[PDB]
Design a protein around this ligand. Sequence first.
Ligand SMILES: Nc1ncnc2c1ncn2[C@@H]1O[C@H](COP(=O)(O)OP(=O)(O)O)[C@@H](O)[C@H]1O
Ligand SMILES: Nc1ncnc2c1ncn2[C@@H]1O[C@H](COP(=O)(O)OP(=O)(O)O)[C@@H](O)[C@H]1O
Ligand SMILES: Nc1ncnc2c1ncn2[C@@H]1O[C@H](COP(=O)(O)O)[C@@H](O)[C@H]1O
Ligand SMILES: Nc1ncnc2c1ncn2[C@@H]1O[C@H](COP(=O)(O)O)[C@@H](O)[C@H]1O
Lengths: 227, 226
Amino acid sequence: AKKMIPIDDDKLIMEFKDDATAFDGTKKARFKGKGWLNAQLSVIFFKLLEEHGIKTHFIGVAGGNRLIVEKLDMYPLEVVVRNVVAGSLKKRLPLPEGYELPEPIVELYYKNDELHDPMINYYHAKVLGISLDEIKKIEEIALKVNEILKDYLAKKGIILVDFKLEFGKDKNGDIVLADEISPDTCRFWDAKTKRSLDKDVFRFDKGDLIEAYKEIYERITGEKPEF
Amino acid sequence: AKKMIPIDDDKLIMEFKDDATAFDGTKKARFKGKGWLNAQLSVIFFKLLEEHGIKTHFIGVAGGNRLIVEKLDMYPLEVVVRNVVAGSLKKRLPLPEGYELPEPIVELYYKNDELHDPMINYYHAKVLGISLDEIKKIEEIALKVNEILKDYLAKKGIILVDFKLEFGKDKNGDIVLADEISPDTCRFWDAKTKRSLDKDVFRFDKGDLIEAYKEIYERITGEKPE
Ligand SMILES: Nc1ncnc2c1ncn2[C@@H]1O[C@H](COP(=O)(O)OP(=O)(O)O)[C@@H](O)[C@H]1O
Ligand SMILES: Nc1ncnc2c1ncn2[C@@H]1O[C@H](COP(=O)(O)OP(=O)(O)O)[C@@H](O)[C@H]1O
Ligand SMILES: Nc1ncnc2c1ncn2[C@@H]1O[C@H](COP(=O)(O)O)[C@@H](O)[C@H]1O
Ligand SMILES: Nc1ncnc2c1ncn2[C@@H]1O[C@H](COP(=O)(O)O)[C@@H](O)[C@H]1O
């Protein structure tokens, strides 16, 4: 759902598309406005994190659905942080969907579509060339990010249930938060009703996608989506 | 503003009074309902914390303004946690009142009225007989308590600006959260307006005390104070 367009050796344009894809592309659709919503939400989040001293790849905006980002040497990881039991965590722990976890959980997955993104631990990560030291930096950043996003969204009646992050190395060798932060890459639930306000609405046809994404945007900004 | 009444070698009664005192007792008053409100708010906070596995001195209630607590060998400390610049932090950092800190700040004060509770570091703590190991336990508990209280209050439109905790050792030698947790010992601001809902209302005559404390209570319980 993104187009990455190289500017040069140190920066690129991340363009958000209106395509919605799930279950390995066996389920596809297009939602007018999704790209714009996701881009804008990414901006909001990256700036919010940046304000707390989190280093992110965000440089600026170049149109409604286009972000300018620093080019990174990417870690071959999905870094997942989980506050409430949902999705695949139900297959790992003996706990009901909706269960509030006493502490956030960080899972690492190997970014590899052919292997369908398997979960890995610190030993696997070393084999893939990621030192124990980098891993603990990554996890520390991820937990910090989790706390800022969770607390921000909670004040607006949104539960941050879980989410996926990606990281890379910049020119200086610092670890930098990358990719996107949107309802495509997080589970957001309404605090009162516990309805999904994210891609699960598409994955399991539980409602109107553009509607839920608008709802997130409206709650955060206090303003109906422009486009 | 509290009366500590020994039951035996392991328990005591903490009684909350309606007396309000500030600036070393040079500014005193009484507010009908304060003790009750403070006691009840302490109950709510201690049980909330106990629900997260924080060990506290809270045993139970013995009337509207009386708590039954475990007797502890107390650390001679105020352990202050700060999320938002206010009060004496303005005199330490070059930052405006209301400034949101990137991380929470933990400060240690030596509990001693004659010295007016001076700030200390880990070296002073050791002199006062507190090991580096205890200090880090204390600080890890304080940071935990901060995150639970801050998140809980935030959902209710209350900013946990800063607060003071006290700790003691029980029979087993575990570190136990003690004293009280009320608008007497924390700074609470309304999220929208940023007005004080705590003892700063009394300290600096910025409004009606019983009103602000009731506000806190009502927001937390969803019910007017009984
Ligand atoms: N700052 C960055 N530098 C280099 N690569 C990035 C950066 N941010 C994201 N990427 C990578 O670009 C790709 C974004 O493509 P996307 O549309 O999310 O689909 P896919 O996961 O199929 O690649 C991902 O591979 C992501 O890891
Ligand atoms: N569980 C406990 N066991 C023993 N002492 C405690 C416990 N909780 C609080 N204390 C102490 O009881 C005293 C109550 O003091 P208080 O009346 O609040 O005013 P001050 O702090 O000015 O003495 C304090 O010295 C406090 O440190
Ligand atoms: N490949 C991916 N792309 C986008 N988001 C993901 C991906 N993998 C996991 N997530 C997010 O990570 C969280 C946990 O997902 P799951 O492991 O499917 O239960 C959810 O918020 C997902 O949206
Ligand atoms: N001696 C004390 N009694 C009660 N509360 C205190 C005391 N010292 C500090 N605090 C609390 O800790 C926070 C920081 O206080 P200060 O350093 O005075 O700005 C405030 O919320 C105070 O209410």
